[PDB]
Amino acid sequence: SHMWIGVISLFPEMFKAITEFGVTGRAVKHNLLKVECWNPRDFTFDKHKTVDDRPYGGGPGMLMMVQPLRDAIHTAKAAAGEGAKVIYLSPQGRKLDQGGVTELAQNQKLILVCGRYEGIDERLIQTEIDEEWSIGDYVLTGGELPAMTLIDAVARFIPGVLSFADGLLDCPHYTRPEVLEGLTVPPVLMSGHHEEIRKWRLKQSLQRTWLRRPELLEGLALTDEQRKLLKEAQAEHNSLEHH
Amino acid sequence: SHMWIGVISLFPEMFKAITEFGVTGRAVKHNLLKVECWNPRDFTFDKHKTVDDRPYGGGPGMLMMVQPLRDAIHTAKAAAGEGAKVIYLSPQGRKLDQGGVTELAQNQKLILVCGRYEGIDERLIQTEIDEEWSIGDYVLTGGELPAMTLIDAVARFIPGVLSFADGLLDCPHYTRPEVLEGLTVPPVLMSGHHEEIRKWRLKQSLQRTWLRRPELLEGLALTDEQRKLLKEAQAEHNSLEHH
Ligand SMILES: Nc1ncnc2c1ncn2[C@@H]1O[C@H](CSCC[C@H](N)C(=O)O)[C@@H](O)[C@H]1O
Ligand SMILES: Nc1ncnc2c1ncn2[C@@H]1O[C@H](CSCC[C@H](N)C(=O)O)[C@@H](O)[C@H]1O
């Protein structure tokens, strides 16, 4: 495969969401993407296969038990061999964005550690984790959805698998029928004028980014054409009434 | 249930990832959370149950076919009744954060529309969607992971189901053993001094937010105690060498 992803999770079956459906599912079946899981529960030795433990200092909540998690990570690393970057999904990590996605996609092998409960022992992050990554400034019940989000995002960059690509939001899209609940498709999109359509899409992207995410535009070096189309969109905006 | 979530998706089975595992799975089995899905494919009438269509204006890629998607949405709305907010998962939507999560959790009913391909017809967003929400500045293959991310995040606020809660990152956590690969647990956490432990955790949160996400601190009104602990952490930081 082009990319191999090792996963450490108490719920391996959750990953069927990406390995059995859609473009990511096709990529897996076609060996373009490989997702292999290791479950800490399989590395426990007590009668009840305990995978959590008490946090020192008290306070509510539990943490992932160290030994089972550590052993699971070691096994994954052994299978991945040298060169596999180990990532821990955490809201305290680097916030994921398209730039980070392209960076991550440069790796041939990745091992994703998914926590549960209140998280994992800080010392494991220091001794076993290479990088911490967050999918957003919000808290989820576990690292599985974040891991799948990361896998899905990077998979789009694997040759054969298939906004922010140019630092801009995407333009509106339209399909049949020509008229929907009284709303028509913009005439230009049905003119067959390839060049005019290209400009419409670019101008729409610029206008939408300016109106919805003006911050994204600031840290962007626009081409001469982009500067022109944006100025046109803003002039058009200033010639109209607004709510 | 406390919260009902209707979902429109071409891959309903993906949602088992949250309805069959962990705390969210328990919440569903216990009727605290209800997730009901409608699949556009079930609303098609042609022999091959076509769910995509060509975008006007050409260009690579396809879009969700309007009729099957529209009909699926209408059915969900009929089942939800009045008061159900309809959300479309999209990278052009409002970027999700803990504040947005708490806002969304105030809804008793939500309908989440998951797109695939290049997205959906802009006119449907205008006629059927109330709000657009993004889980991050990156692009995924479909709206299912984003929808599950939103559901998981809001579920944590449903009574009985169970960083950024106080606008700060969480503190480090530790569990057995006392010594791990030569690294010991901070002595204070094993002192049994409740008050000192509380302060250590708060100071750690402040220090970590300052070092990793200084922007988060700016737009925050710190209490007197928080201002003191942060100043102490910064003074401690300035008394040491750094890499
Ligand atoms: N936005 C996010 N991105 C990546 N992983 C996330 C996430 N929200 C939750 N998780 C992961 O899910 C698990 C349970 S959440 C524990 C959260 C903890 N109090 C803290 O703020 O660090 C953890 O392993 C956590 O890192
Ligand atoms: N970060 C994100 N948050 C919410 N939904 C997302 C997402 N990334 C992808 N999707 C959703 O997954 C589907 C396929 S991605 C189509 C993306 C399109 N070119 C655009 O930038 O709008 C769409 O319905 C899209 O809205």
DSSP string across A14-67: GGHHHHSSHHHHHHHHTTSEEEEEE-GGGG--STT---EEPPTT--S--EE-HH
Q: How many C-beta neighbours within 10 Å does residue A62 have?
A: 16
Q: Which of A63, A65, A71 is nearest to A50 (CA)?
A: A65
For residue B141, list chain A residues with Cβ-Cβ distance below 8 A: 22-24, 152, 155-156
* A82 contacts A74 by C-beta, under 8 angstroms: no
Residue of B11, B21, B139 with shortest CB distance to A156: B139
- Separation of B141 CA from ligand 2 center, angstroms? 7
Contact B63 A121 (CB under 8 A): no
* A18 contacts A148 by C-beta, under 8 angstroms: yes
Residue with the nearest Cα to atom 18 of ligand 1? A118
Q: How far is CA A84 from CA A73, A81, A110, A129, in A?
A: 12, 7, 5, 11
**Ligand closest to CA B98:** 1
Q: What backbone torsions phi and psi does residue A12 show, to the nearest 5 degrees?
A: -50, -35
Distance, CA of B54 to CA of B60 (rounded, Å)? 9
> What domains sit in chain A, N to C, each tagged with a CATH number?
1-162 (3.40.1280.10), 163-243 (1.10.1270.20)
Resolution of this entry, Å? 1.8
Token pair listed for A21: 């459906």
For testing contact with chain B, the best of A173, A196, A197, A207 (most B CBs within 10 A): A173
* A143 contacts A90 by C-beta, under 8 angstroms: yes
**Rg from Cα positions in chain A:** 23
* A27 contacts B136 by C-beta, under 8 angstroms: no
Instruction: Report strand pairing: A109-113 vs A85-95.
Output: parallel
Structural biology method used = X-ray
**DSSP 8-state class, residue B172:** P
Token pair listed for B136: 């991050």
Residue A37 one-letter amino acid: C
User: Measured between CA atoms, how close is B127 to chain A, in angstroms?
Assistant: 8
